[PDB]
Design a protein around this nucleic acid. Structure first.
Ligand code: MG
Length: 164
RNA sequence: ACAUUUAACUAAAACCCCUACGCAUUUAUAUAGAGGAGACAAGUCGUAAAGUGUACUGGAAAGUGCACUU
């Protein structure tokens, strides 16, 4: 797959219409080797439904796409990155579903098909979650998803979904 | 534990005890499994008020609390 080039920091600064490098208020992992490492540690994703959060520039997104994922659902809150994610989607037809929304409220139990929903006592249900979010958002999210596991609802309606 | 016999008109003969050491003790090797250090990985890799210590941290790219230094 011929994916478009990864944005540089100058291109990111222009994209946020910020015109400077000091007021980013955000840190980007623009090194594809570390993102490749992270996706490797996420497990074998060949033909796996991956729900990715906090894409931003899209290093994790490109790394996941390079793995033979079946469908990749992406949720982005900043609309300014949606153009880049859209070009990335055009590069990979039918393997990227972008959604503009907030991960603390987005409802994943309806995103993927119902044929995926495996029992709790069987193996994890081929659905993986990967995320590099702001640290101010990852802890409410993990608390919320722990509550979901305790209730066996939300992303864990499919079974014992693994998170990275 | 165990015990002085014969013999002695030259002088000699005889002698023979019974008790472990083991699921004890020392060190070493082999084996399941787990954990460390080394090579700043080399590129046909990518690019352009502050500080120190300590305590909590569940909206932690660091914050707040206390004490310090310039
Ligand atoms: Mg706090």
């Amino acid at each position: 797959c011929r994916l478009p080039p990864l944005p540089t920091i100058r291109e990111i600064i222009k994209l946020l219409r910020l015109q400077a490098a000091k007021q980013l208020s955000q840190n980007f992992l623009l090194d594809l080797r570390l993102t490749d490492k992270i996706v490797r540690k996420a497990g074998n994703l060949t033909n796996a439904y991956v729900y990715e959060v906090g894409p931003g520039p899209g290093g994790i997104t490109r790394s996941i796409l390079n793995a033979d994922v079946a469908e990749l659902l992406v949720v982005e809150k900043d609309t300014r990155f949606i153009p880049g994610l859209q070009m990335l989607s055009d590069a990979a037809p039918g393997k990227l579903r972008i959604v503009h929304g907030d991960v603390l409220t987005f409802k994943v139990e309806k995103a993927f098909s119902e044929s995926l929903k495996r029992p709790w006592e069987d193996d994890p249900p081929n659905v993986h979650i990967i995320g590099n979010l702001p640290f101010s958002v990852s802890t409410p999210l993990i608390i919320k998803w722990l509550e979901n596991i305790s209730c066996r609802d939300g992303p864990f309606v499919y079974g014992r979904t693994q998170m990275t």
